[PDB]
């Protein structure tokens, strides 16, 4: 429920060695420039900015 | 600014060209790993089924010392009589694919002594691949053949040896010579009516013999007529093209193609799900709606024999369907969300 | 040339590559009775690269 991808598309790259943060940032770049991170709930989020 | 100052090129954001071919290297890329033994030609003029039978009439063979035999039920009303020792018939062909050795067959329409009981000479066949000679004796000294189609490669009729099952490379100059190597009981000899060196296509059509892939009709109507016979080309090649890949859902797709003919079993089949193929029959342009939006497009193409004719052997399938300027367009989002209140437009100009 | 030509035979050389440093054995063997008493007389044998 914390995941809201603004432009969901298929990945054509195998991200199979990247630091997770770098992969997530690449995903955000491909999508609508989303914010990601870990909440104080210890839950991951990926959602539209602002 | 009303317009671009001297526009060079213009493309759609509604349709994206996901696959195309227009040259040899492009066609090789999208056909995938076709083996050298497959009967398909990739050329500057398109992709085309390979000539697979070299059906040659009596009067068209290279003559030496052979008798001019005329009976109405022979093709073109005539055949060549192998009358005597050292008198020969020669045929040249160049295969435009590799013929695997097991698959080579030499069909002759041949009859002894105008249908008489009395033997013709023993026949030796010499096959020459770029100077490499293979010789065998399919017909014995004491045999008569009724007017029928016979394979002189893989069967013997009183003879001592068959074709040695050698592979024939693409672009080899192949000379085939038939020689009566002994004396004749019957003065009119073995009359050969039409010669068909052919690839049996048993890799393509799962039947154990060339009869499964070609016509071998044995009735020209007895009036000096022509014969349907072994057609020059394979019946139907179904070509699976490499998957046209997308990052986004394809809802519908459109194709464009240039062809010499589109009759018979010509079709283009398109799928979204990799299995439910939607067929467009007998057209160079076509549009397909997929049941649900999905990612990657798969294409199947059917190329066939064509033409009917009454002035030469063979009468059927003397032409093959050639296709060139393949284009596959899909309904894909080219205008895309990018940020809050930002769109990105990604048009493509093909090379 | 026995490798590439044939004379009433049943099979020819499947044109397969000879690696450098491989130990080739070549065996010519009679597999039928002979009409002639002299048989096939082998005078000189040359396996060779046609170049
Ligand atoms: K972005
Ligand atoms: K080929
Ligand atoms: Mg003669
Ligand atoms: Mg054979
Ligand atoms: Mg004829
Ligand atoms: Mg060889």
Automatic annotation (TrEMBL), chain B:
Transmembrane parts of this sequence: none
Q: Where does Mg(2+) 11 bind?
A: 154, 165
Specify the superkingdom: Viruses
Residues that bind Mg(2+) 10: 65, 83-84, 87
Binding positions for Mg(2+) 9? 57-58, 75, 78, 193
The protein depicted here goes by the name Baseplate hub
This chain's source organism reads: Haloferax tailed virus 1 (HFTV1)
Q: What is the lineage of its organism?
A: Viruses, Duplodnaviria, Heunggongvirae, Uroviricota, Caudoviricetes
TrEMBL record, chain C:
Output the lineage of the source organism: Viruses, Duplodnaviria, Heunggongvirae, Uroviricota, Caudoviricetes
Parent protein range shown?
A: 704 to 754 of 954
Specify which residues bind Mg(2+) 9 according to the UniProt entry for this protein: 43
Give the species this sequence originates from: Haloferax tailed virus 1 (HFTV1)
Q: Which domain of life is it from?
A: Viruses
Positions with a binding annotation for Mg(2+) 11: 4, 15
Which segments does the entry list as coiled coil? none
Q: What is this protein called?
A: Baseplate hub
């Amino acid at each position: 429920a914390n995941i809201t991808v603004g432009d969901d598309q298929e990945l054509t790259r195998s991200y199979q060695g990247d630091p997770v943060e770098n992969a997530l940032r690449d995903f955000a770049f491909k999508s609508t420039n989303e914010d990601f991170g870990v909440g104080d709930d210890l839950e991951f989020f990926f959602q539209p900015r602002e | 600014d009303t317009t671009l100052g001297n526009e060079l090129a213009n493309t759609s954001l509604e349709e994206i060209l996901i696959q195309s071919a227009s040259s040899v290297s492009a066609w090789n890329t999208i056909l995938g790993t076709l083996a050298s033994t497959y009967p398909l030609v990739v050329s500057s003029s398109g992709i085309r089924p390979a000539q697979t039978a070299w059906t040659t009439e009596s009067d068209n063979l290279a003559q030496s010392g052979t008798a001019l035999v005329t009976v109405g039920d022979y093709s073109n009303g005539e055949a060549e009589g192998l009358d005597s020792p050292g008198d020969t018939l020669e045929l040249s062909f160049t295969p435009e694919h590799d013929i695997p050795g097991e698959e080579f067959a030499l069909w002759c329409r041949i009859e002894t002594d105008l249908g008489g009981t009395d033997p013709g000479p023993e026949i030796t066949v010499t096959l020459d691949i770029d100077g490499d000679t293979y010789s065998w004796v399919p017909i014995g000294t004491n045999t008569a053949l009724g007017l029928n189609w016979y394979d002189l490669a893989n069967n013997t009729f009183g003879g001592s040896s068959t074709y040695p099952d050698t592979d024939i490379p693409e672009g080899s100059t192949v000379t085939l010579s038939i020689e009566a190597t002994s004396s004749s009981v019957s003065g009119q000899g073995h009359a050969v009516d039409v010669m068909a060196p052919l690839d049996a296509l048993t890799r393509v059509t799962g039947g154990s013999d060339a009869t499964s892939a070609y016509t071998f009709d044995n009735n020209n109507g007895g009036s000096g007529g022509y014969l349907d016979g072994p057609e020059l080309y394979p019946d139907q090649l179904i070509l699976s093209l490499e998957t046209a890949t997308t990052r986004r859902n394809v809802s519908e797709a459109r194709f464009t193609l240039t062809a010499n003919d589109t009759s018979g079993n010509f079709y283009v089949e398109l799928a979204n799900d990799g299995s439910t193929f939607n067929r467009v029959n007998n057209a160079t342009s076509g549009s397909v709606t997929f049941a649900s939006p999905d990612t990657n497009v798969d294409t199947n193409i059917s190329l066939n024999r064509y033409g009917s004719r009454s002035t030469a052997t063979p009468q059927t399938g003397f032409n093959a369907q050639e296709i060139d300027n393949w284009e596959l367009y899909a309904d894909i989002d080219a205008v895309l969300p990018d940020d809050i209140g930002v769109t990105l437009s990604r048009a493509i100009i093909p090379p």
